[PDB]
Subunit: 163 residues, 2 copies
């Protein structure tokens, strides 16, 4: 928990300090920046990519105009699994930045049940319908609300077992 607990604080600091605004949106480098911030000083491979290189290039080039397009891009990044660890927590922040830029909305994760999220994610390689339906019902335009942000981060970490 000590690794996860310190990462949780890093995630909170990322938004509080406003450093989140310096993260490149929708790119591999951006995802690396997030991973580096979250696990810097914890994982030796923080911000480091574990073919995979060519797949990531194709993924970041995917369009981000619609919710459906954004989710499709998110699902391949998840399948890509670019880091040894910390993929889900970093990618979910990665997703929100993309949603905020293009749709001016983010996912209110605190209202996204663990059971429904994991099922939808597990199913997404075959069909992302479950994931699209779940996340779309939980979009909010209140993208700078700290309650939504901090509670969202807590839920995100809850998805992987930290509490």
């Amino acid at each position: 928990k000590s690794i996860d607990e310190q990462s949780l604080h890093n995630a909170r600091r990322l938004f509080e300090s406003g450093d989140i605004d310096r993260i490149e949106v929708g790119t591999t480098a951006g995802l690396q920046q997030i991973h580096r911030y979250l696990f810097g000083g914890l994982y030796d491979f923080a911000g480091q990519i574990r073919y995979l290189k060519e797949a990531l290039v194709k993924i970041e080039q995917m369009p981000e105009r619609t919710f459906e397009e954004i989710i499709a891009k998110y699902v391949r990044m998840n399948i890509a699994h670019p880091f040894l660890e910390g993929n889900g927590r970093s990618t979910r922040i990665w997703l929100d930045l993309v949603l905020k830029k293009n749709l001016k909305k983010v996912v209110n994760w605190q209202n996204v049940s663990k059971t429904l999220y994991l099922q939808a994610m597990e199913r997404s390689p075959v069909n992302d319908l479950e994931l699209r339906f779940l996340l779309k019902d939980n979009l909010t335009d209140d993208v700078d609300n700290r309650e939504i942000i901090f509670k969202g981060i807590e839920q995100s970490y809850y998805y992987e077992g930290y509490e």
Copy 2:
């Protein structure tokens, strides 16, 4: 994946014979193990997160089983690393047992539930821990079956399987 990659590191430590260059019963020695096990995984691999306490601990005698276990318990309470204390310290314990008593713990026969109970109790009383580990000592310290199966059990203690 971290645990899986670390498990291979632990296996290589004995396979390569690098285990024989590890300093026995010292803080620096424990750091060497931790570095070997989690190098390239933990940023703080081999690094202490206490220092004066560690100095006192490594100076503790290793003449008897009872003394070694007392030293082991002390190191456990110290919790010198942010993570990976248990897996690295158990290797640390075996080296001390091998050096002084020519025995090691046959971990594969040490039940997880019983081990965790004994460890939790050890700060109050190490009787449970001493008894459990003593029944599972073996002088066959170079048996590779015992070693590799032992490492697997050690990693199982913290939840990896």
